[PDB]
């Protein structure tokens with residue numbers, strides 16, 4: 801059902817994550833990690849201490865879709881395994897250094913056409929699909945967005961709930 805998901809989302813914070821390519825989102829789904837640019841890395845570290853759950857909602861640039869959502873399980877960390885991200889032009893590995901661990905809540909896609917009725921107060925009430933990497937999504941809009949995704953019956957939210 802949707803009851804455990806609603807519990808995880810209670811009083812959560814939500815952030816839009818934008819990726820230039822599918823390869824990096826596939827790697828994030830396989831390994832449970834994400835890296836972002838230093839400005840957003842600072843914002844996410846602050847949010848992680850401030851909320852029971854910090855939810856990252858992923859969208860690959862030019863895909864017209866969200867590719868799923870995940871909960872931060874840690875602040876960013878350095879020096880571990882260099883993740884083999886595909887880097888866009890003008891992007892170095894030292895800029896994507898700093899690895900967050902994430903627990904996927906939904907690995908299913910949602911087309912932007914399905915979220916056209918949701919606007920984000922923190923981005924001038926533009927449709928929630930609009931935003932830069934790291935754009936915060938207000939609680940009510942983020943909750944409704946996450947509830948639009950198809951259920952991912954391959955995920956048991958029991959272990960996620962314990963980490964709260």
Ligand SMILES: CNc1nc(Cl)nc2c1ncn2Cc1ccccc1NS(C)(=O)=O
Nearest residue numbers: 818819820821824835836837885888932933
């Ligand atoms: C593994 N982490 C990432 N991997 C990829 Cl391939 N792209 C990312 C990632 N993190 C943020 N981006 C988007 C981006 C790339 C370059 C310059 C600015 C921006 N941010 S923007 C204009 O809002 O889209």
